[PDB]
Symmetry: C3
């Protein structure tokens, strides 16, 4: 329930975290 | 205290979406 | 349930750090 929500967030944050490293790279 | 988790949750999914949006705008700009 | 509390705080940390990284870039 909540945990579905937690886990969906660490996905979105990870991708945003990923896009940043890439953008800082690019 | 489940309301608090609920509240903390919803505030996080709000902040993250705004960042997600902030990101796409930059990638655009 | 602590894991739930722990997962929360680890997320609000990443997000603030993420927000901080952007404001730095919005400068450039």
């Amino acid at each position: 329930d909540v945990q579905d929500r937690l886990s969906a967030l660490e996905s979105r944050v990870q991708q945003q975290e990923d896009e940043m490293t890439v953008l800082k790279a690019a």
